Amino acid sequence: GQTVRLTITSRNAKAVESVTSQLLTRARDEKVTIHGPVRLPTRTLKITTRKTPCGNGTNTWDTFELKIYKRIIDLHAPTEQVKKITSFTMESGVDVSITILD
Amino acid sequence: GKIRTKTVKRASRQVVEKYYSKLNFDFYQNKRVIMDVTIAESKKLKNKIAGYTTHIMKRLARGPVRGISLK
Amino acid sequence: SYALKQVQTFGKKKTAIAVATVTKAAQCNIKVNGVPLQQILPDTLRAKIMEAITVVGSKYYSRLRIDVAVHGGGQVSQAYAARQAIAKGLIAFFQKYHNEVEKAALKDKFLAYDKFLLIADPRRCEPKKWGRHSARTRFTKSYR
Amino acid sequence: SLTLIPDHFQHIVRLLNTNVEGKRKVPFALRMVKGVGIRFAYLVCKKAGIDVERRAGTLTAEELEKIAEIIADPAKFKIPDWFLNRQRDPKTGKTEHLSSSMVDTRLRDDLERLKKMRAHRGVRHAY
Amino acid sequence: SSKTPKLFNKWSFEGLETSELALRDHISTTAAYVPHTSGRWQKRRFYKARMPIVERLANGLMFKGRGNGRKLQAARLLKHTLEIIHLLTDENPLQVVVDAVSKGAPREDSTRRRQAVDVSPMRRVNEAIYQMCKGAREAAFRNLKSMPECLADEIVNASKGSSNSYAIKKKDEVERVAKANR
Amino acid sequence: NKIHRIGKRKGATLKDVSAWRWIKTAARHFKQEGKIFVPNCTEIMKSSHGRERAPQNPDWYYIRCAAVLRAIYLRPGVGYGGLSKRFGNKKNYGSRPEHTVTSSTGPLHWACKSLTKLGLVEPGAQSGQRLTRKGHKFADSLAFQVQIRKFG
Amino acid sequence: EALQNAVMFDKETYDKLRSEVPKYKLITPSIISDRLKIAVSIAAAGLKQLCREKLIRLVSCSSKTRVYTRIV
Amino acid sequence: QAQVGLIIKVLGRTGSRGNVTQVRVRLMAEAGSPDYNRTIVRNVKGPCKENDMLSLMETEREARRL
RNA sequence: AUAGGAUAGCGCAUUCGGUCGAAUUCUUCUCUGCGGGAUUCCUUUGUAAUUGCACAAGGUGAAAUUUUGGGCAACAGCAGGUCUGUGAUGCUCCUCAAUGUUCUGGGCGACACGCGCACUACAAUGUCAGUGAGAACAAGAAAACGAACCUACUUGAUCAAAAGAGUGGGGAAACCCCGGAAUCACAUAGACCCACUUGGGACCGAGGAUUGCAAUUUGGUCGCGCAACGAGGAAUGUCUCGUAGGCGCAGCUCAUCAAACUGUGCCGAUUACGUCCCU
Ligand SMILES: [Mg+2]
Ligand SMILES: [Mg+2]
């Protein structure tokens, strides 16, 4: 009837996968309807800068990339059950957001 | 340029010495044995080791090879 | 009544992806992006699209309705993807609704005429590198 | 056009004291007169009501001056002001379309005015 | 229900044979509906010999910055050129093209003083296409004749071994110089 | 033979026939009917500011209206920005590199207004322009006439 | 030397187009203009008119290239 | 005018820039002809391989061995 | 058809992202964290071997040789650049009409010239004017309730463009977006017809918009084109397959302003598959 979305975002692929697996395991233990863990497209932030600090020599460039991993989990559970599912140790560098879908 | 680096050659020779009755003339079964009998961070090296182990076994069938001593 | 016979295939050339749906029907028609083959322009690309049909023959595509949705790439890549999708959809339909004595003969003719009719082209754009105007060409060098 | 050359066809036509080639089409030969471009020539042809596929030597003198006076007074023929080159004269404030030697005369007068005023563009043109 | 391909659905490839024994294995006569057949012909060394000859002409027409990468333009120009050749010769334009390619390149030229050497069969096919397309392109630069016609007379003249063709004129002077320093 | 039905097929719809044939037939039908509204500014203004010359075709407004009708048929709920993207062109900027320029939305607005006046198209819910009942019927009937080769 | 090409059909050139241009094995606007010392535009117009009168038949056609030949 | 020959063996690439290819050619002549199975050494420019065909023009000259 | 060719169809006729239709099922495409897959693996009465290490063809395959493009990269150097990145600094110099700091006006863009690198040209495999079909990479709003940012759609519109309004949406796989890119196509029965010309836009005139504190910036409109330039001497760059070349698009700097760069897709060749002549 009422559906709630968990959004897990991180820079660390291993950390976000571990948190998503932990949330899935908790949801399965709680026996709630789960609309799968959806892997949203990974987003790459790219910045290219000159390698030199002075402008001398061959114009060599440096490319830095930062990857963003996002997962969403849809479940039918009230606020107390969702809070009990989400309350555990978590990991650093990842964040989980609660939303209510209408 | 498909020469087997000394790391690959030494690992394959050690594999042949340690497991000889457990190997075969094909590449895929040898590689399947290699995955269990060796620990490595890479799969390209495992494939190369399996290929050179198959080559070593084919040579060993015809005659003894230098660097490998079967007790 | 009668069971629906559906087969979906895909053909890729560069970025272009063409999804072809093949269904049994009373009257055979083939439309690429909602456009009939005769209405497809230019005659250069329409010839390439019809190459999928004429290699094996019209009797195999008879009573078969095929629609193609192509997305990405330019006109030439879309045409190649569409023809590959049509050829792969024919072979797939025969594989699912006919014996293997045939279908293999159709595959033989397709492969003999053109490998790319049934097998996707692996070529893709090479990335651009700094200090180079393109993938290969380098910045102009001056001495005096 | 598949039309025979008229007996009055002339290769060089005099329009607003300028020579115009009769081989070229009407607008592409009306663009020869200074003050008239491609767009202005096409609009002049439309206002005169003559076919743009005709040659410039086949037109008669009864419409030659008609074209010339259209060019002289375009605003009279409901040609919009924004289509004219001189929309607001900095001296007189009127709207007109200079043509033939008038554009050169007005340019020389503008340069002389800037020179006398002693502006940056006066001295830049003087350089 | 299958039928043998015909170029532009008009010209048949049946009976396409090189006029002479030379370049027999290097002039391809495989039937194809249209010149544009995208493939990796440059991956191997002699794989370009298997390319259909009309496609090779279309590729040769793809020169200069204005004409680089325009293969549909080349296909259309060849479509008109084959019609013009058929009108001029009352003969199969594919056969005329094969004959022109067969006799449009020198069989001997000098190299480094300079010593005369033979020409490989692969290069003769390449140079025949290169000279014929180059001869038409410069011919159709600033004259009233359009490109499909300028390419038509070049192929017709080359097929008859006439000195009016740019490829034949280059062939005569190149072989003449080769014999001079032979 | 060219007119005859292929077999087991009846009638015709839009996008089943030649786009240029349909557009020219629709423009000719509009000109013969004469109920369309032609702005006086169409005889002077250009189709887009990216272009450097006048349209030079007397029936250019009718052709543009027919093309806009076909575009509304193909993409329901499309607006003047989408039509400008459809009818854009590459503008010559002089010695500077050429860049794509979207068509001026004024002519598209005028063509859409003329189509609503004719009743062929109407504003849709939550923005955009959509085809009407008679617009869809007229498009399909003209598409059938195109392969009939009546051509007005 | 700059060629001089007429922009309109003359009395003699028109009947020369109507009579001499047919029975040509290959007919194109460029070569017709070359023969008659006329412009390619009016040459193409006259060739289209001849096709309308069915004196010559159009074999190869395109938005920019037209090829004609004699009627057999 | 132009007698044909088959490429039997491809020798090394003669030349400082490696553009010419020394090669062995067997003349293609009918049985009983004086040039039947006549083997000659010749220099060829362009991409050449074994079992290729080459019109020799004049077959009197023999390429100097490299 | 205008003169109207060619180019598949022969239980059940096609269509209709606004018909904003309902219902049901599923994952062909798509998304993506871990997997796999290629190893000379297989085959030559190949080469070589005369142990080997290998190699060349063909096979198998999505891919067949460092699979491909990157990144990383030893050990010595260089009086190479940077004391204009830094609260990196030693030694010096200025230090209150200051070598500090602010503010105002001007310069950094001034020309006869020489040179590097770009961009646009010299037209017809073209230029205008129509129609058609069609990518990818991306970016979006704010401190010590929303408002700035990006957008669609409408209107202006009872009448050019450029504007200007209004109304929504998007914190971005959600809006833009079904991303209508330009190369390209067109049997468009379109104009031109070999000329410095409707090729080419240098350069300048008059109006109006818009950015901005400031325009003595930037669009848009009408003139100018009669500015060279018709393919470039001696010279000399880069490049081997989705490559060169052609064509756009995005990000970036950024109030405003890309002939730049960093990416990205589109269309797509010639040649070589060698060699040590040159360097
Ligand atoms: Mg120093
Ligand atoms: Mg810069």
Short mmCIF file of N, CA and C in Angstrom, two decimals, chain E residues 82-150:
data_model
loop_
_atom_site.label_atom_id
_atom_site.label_comp_id
_atom_site.label_asym_id
_atom_site.label_seq_id
_atom_site.Cartn_x
_atom_site.Cartn_y
_atom_site.Cartn_z
N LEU E 82 27.93 4.86 -65.10
CA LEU E 82 27.67 3.59 -65.79
C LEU E 82 26.63 3.76 -66.89
N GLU E 83 25.59 4.56 -66.63
CA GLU E 83 24.62 4.87 -67.67
C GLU E 83 25.28 5.58 -68.85
N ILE E 84 26.13 6.57 -68.57
CA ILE E 84 26.77 7.31 -69.65
C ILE E 84 27.70 6.40 -70.45
N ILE E 85 28.42 5.51 -69.76
CA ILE E 85 29.32 4.58 -70.43
C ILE E 85 28.52 3.62 -71.31
N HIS E 86 27.39 3.12 -70.80
CA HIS E 86 26.56 2.23 -71.60
C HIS E 86 26.04 2.93 -72.85
N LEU E 87 25.63 4.20 -72.71
CA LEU E 87 25.20 4.95 -73.89
C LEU E 87 26.34 5.15 -74.87
N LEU E 88 27.54 5.44 -74.37
CA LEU E 88 28.66 5.75 -75.26
C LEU E 88 29.19 4.51 -75.98
N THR E 89 29.16 3.35 -75.33
CA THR E 89 29.82 2.16 -75.85
C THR E 89 28.89 1.07 -76.35
N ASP E 90 27.62 1.08 -75.95
CA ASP E 90 26.69 -0.01 -76.25
C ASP E 90 27.26 -1.35 -75.77
N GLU E 91 27.85 -1.32 -74.57
CA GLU E 91 28.50 -2.48 -73.98
C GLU E 91 28.29 -2.41 -72.48
N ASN E 92 28.51 -3.53 -71.80
CA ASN E 92 28.33 -3.58 -70.36
C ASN E 92 29.31 -2.63 -69.68
N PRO E 93 28.83 -1.64 -68.91
CA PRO E 93 29.75 -0.73 -68.22
C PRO E 93 30.67 -1.43 -67.25
N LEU E 94 30.23 -2.53 -66.62
CA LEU E 94 31.12 -3.29 -65.76
C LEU E 94 32.29 -3.86 -66.55
N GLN E 95 32.01 -4.42 -67.73
CA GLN E 95 33.08 -4.95 -68.57
C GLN E 95 34.01 -3.84 -69.06
N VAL E 96 33.44 -2.68 -69.41
CA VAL E 96 34.27 -1.55 -69.83
C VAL E 96 35.18 -1.10 -68.70
N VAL E 97 34.64 -1.05 -67.48
CA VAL E 97 35.43 -0.65 -66.31
C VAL E 97 36.55 -1.66 -66.06
N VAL E 98 36.23 -2.95 -66.18
CA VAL E 98 37.25 -3.98 -65.99
C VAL E 98 38.36 -3.84 -67.03
N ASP E 99 37.99 -3.60 -68.29
CA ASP E 99 38.99 -3.42 -69.33
C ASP E 99 39.86 -2.19 -69.07
N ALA E 100 39.24 -1.08 -68.66
CA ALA E 100 40.00 0.13 -68.37
C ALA E 100 40.96 -0.08 -67.21
N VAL E 101 40.52 -0.79 -66.16
CA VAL E 101 41.41 -1.09 -65.05
C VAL E 101 42.54 -2.00 -65.49
N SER E 102 42.24 -2.95 -66.38
CA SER E 102 43.25 -3.89 -66.86
C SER E 102 44.31 -3.22 -67.72
N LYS E 103 43.96 -2.20 -68.51
CA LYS E 103 44.94 -1.57 -69.38
C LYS E 103 45.21 -0.11 -69.03
N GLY E 104 44.94 0.32 -67.80
CA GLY E 104 45.16 1.70 -67.42
C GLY E 104 46.41 1.99 -66.62
N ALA E 105 47.28 1.00 -66.41
CA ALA E 105 48.47 1.21 -65.60
C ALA E 105 49.71 0.69 -66.32
N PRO E 106 50.87 1.30 -66.06
CA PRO E 106 52.10 0.81 -66.69
C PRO E 106 52.49 -0.57 -66.18
N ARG E 107 53.12 -1.34 -67.07
CA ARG E 107 53.65 -2.65 -66.74
C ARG E 107 55.13 -2.61 -66.37
N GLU E 108 55.78 -1.46 -66.50
CA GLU E 108 57.20 -1.33 -66.22
C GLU E 108 57.53 0.14 -66.00
N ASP E 109 58.29 0.43 -64.95
CA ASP E 109 58.72 1.79 -64.68
C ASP E 109 60.07 1.75 -63.97
N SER E 110 60.76 2.89 -63.99
CA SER E 110 62.10 2.99 -63.44
C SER E 110 62.06 3.33 -61.95
N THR E 111 63.16 3.03 -61.27
CA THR E 111 63.32 3.33 -59.86
C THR E 111 64.80 3.42 -59.55
N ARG E 112 65.11 4.01 -58.39
CA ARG E 112 66.50 4.20 -57.98
C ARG E 112 66.97 3.06 -57.09
N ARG E 113 72.02 5.23 -62.39
CA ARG E 113 71.06 5.85 -61.48
C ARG E 113 69.76 5.06 -61.45
N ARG E 114 68.74 5.57 -62.13
CA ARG E 114 67.44 4.92 -62.17
C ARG E 114 67.52 3.64 -62.99
N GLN E 115 66.88 2.58 -62.50
CA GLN E 115 66.85 1.29 -63.16
C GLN E 115 65.41 0.86 -63.38
N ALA E 116 65.11 0.37 -64.58
CA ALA E 116 63.76 -0.08 -64.88
C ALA E 116 63.44 -1.36 -64.12
N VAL E 117 62.23 -1.41 -63.55
CA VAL E 117 61.76 -2.58 -62.82
C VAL E 117 60.33 -2.88 -63.24
N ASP E 118 59.91 -4.11 -63.01
CA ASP E 118 58.54 -4.50 -63.30
C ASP E 118 57.59 -3.98 -62.23
N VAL E 119 56.30 -4.02 -62.54
CA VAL E 119 55.25 -3.58 -61.63
C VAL E 119 54.47 -4.81 -61.18
N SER E 120 54.25 -4.93 -59.88
CA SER E 120 53.49 -6.05 -59.35
C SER E 120 52.04 -5.95 -59.82
N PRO E 121 51.34 -7.08 -59.94
CA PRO E 121 49.94 -7.02 -60.38
C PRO E 121 49.05 -6.22 -59.45
N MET E 122 49.35 -6.21 -58.15
CA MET E 122 48.53 -5.48 -57.20
C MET E 122 48.63 -3.98 -57.45
N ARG E 123 49.84 -3.48 -57.71
CA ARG E 123 50.02 -2.05 -57.92
C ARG E 123 49.40 -1.58 -59.24
N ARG E 124 49.37 -2.45 -60.25
CA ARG E 124 48.77 -2.07 -61.52
C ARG E 124 47.28 -1.81 -61.37
N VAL E 125 46.59 -2.63 -60.57
CA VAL E 125 45.18 -2.37 -60.29
C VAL E 125 45.02 -1.07 -59.52
N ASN E 126 45.89 -0.84 -58.53
CA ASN E 126 45.82 0.39 -57.74
C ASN E 126 46.08 1.62 -58.59
N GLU E 127 47.10 1.57 -59.45
CA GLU E 127 47.47 2.75 -60.23
C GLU E 127 46.45 3.03 -61.33
N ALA E 128 45.83 1.98 -61.88
CA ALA E 128 44.80 2.19 -62.89
C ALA E 128 43.61 2.94 -62.31
N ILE E 129 43.19 2.58 -61.10
CA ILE E 129 42.11 3.30 -60.44
C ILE E 129 42.56 4.70 -60.04
N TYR E 130 43.79 4.82 -59.55
CA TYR E 130 44.28 6.12 -59.10
C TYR E 130 44.39 7.11 -60.25
N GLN E 131 44.95 6.67 -61.38
CA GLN E 131 45.12 7.58 -62.52
C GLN E 131 43.77 7.95 -63.13
N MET E 132 42.86 6.99 -63.24
CA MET E 132 41.57 7.26 -63.88
C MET E 132 40.75 8.24 -63.06
N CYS E 133 40.69 8.05 -61.74
CA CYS E 133 39.96 8.98 -60.89
C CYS E 133 40.65 10.34 -60.84
N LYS E 134 41.98 10.35 -60.79
CA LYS E 134 42.71 11.61 -60.81
C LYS E 134 42.53 12.34 -62.14
N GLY E 135 42.53 11.60 -63.25
CA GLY E 135 42.36 12.23 -64.54
C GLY E 135 41.00 12.88 -64.70
N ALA E 136 39.95 12.24 -64.17
CA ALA E 136 38.61 12.81 -64.25
C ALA E 136 38.46 14.01 -63.32
N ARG E 137 39.06 13.94 -62.13
CA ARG E 137 38.88 15.01 -61.15
C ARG E 137 39.48 16.33 -61.64
N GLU E 138 40.68 16.28 -62.20
CA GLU E 138 41.28 17.50 -62.74
C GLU E 138 40.57 17.96 -64.01
N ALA E 139 40.04 17.01 -64.79
CA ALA E 139 39.31 17.37 -66.00
C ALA E 139 38.04 18.14 -65.68
N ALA E 140 37.34 17.76 -64.61
CA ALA E 140 36.06 18.36 -64.25
C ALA E 140 36.21 19.50 -63.25
N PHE E 141 37.35 20.19 -63.24
CA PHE E 141 37.56 21.22 -62.23
C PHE E 141 36.78 22.50 -62.54
N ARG E 142 37.09 23.15 -63.66
CA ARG E 142 36.47 24.43 -64.00
C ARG E 142 36.00 24.43 -65.44
N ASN E 143 35.30 23.37 -65.84
CA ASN E 143 34.70 23.28 -67.15
C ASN E 143 33.22 22.93 -67.00
N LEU E 144 32.48 23.10 -68.09
CA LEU E 144 31.03 22.90 -68.03
C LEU E 144 30.67 21.43 -67.83
N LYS E 145 31.53 20.52 -68.28
CA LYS E 145 31.26 19.10 -68.13
C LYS E 145 31.22 18.71 -66.66
N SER E 146 30.20 17.95 -66.28
CA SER E 146 30.06 17.52 -64.90
C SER E 146 30.94 16.31 -64.62
N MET E 147 31.06 15.97 -63.34
CA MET E 147 31.94 14.87 -62.93
C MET E 147 31.53 13.53 -63.52
N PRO E 148 30.25 13.11 -63.49
CA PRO E 148 29.93 11.79 -64.05
C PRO E 148 30.28 11.64 -65.52
N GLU E 149 30.19 12.71 -66.31
CA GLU E 149 30.58 12.62 -67.71
C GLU E 149 32.10 12.58 -67.85
N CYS E 150 32.81 13.43 -67.10
CA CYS E 150 34.27 13.44 -67.18
C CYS E 150 34.86 12.11 -66.77
#
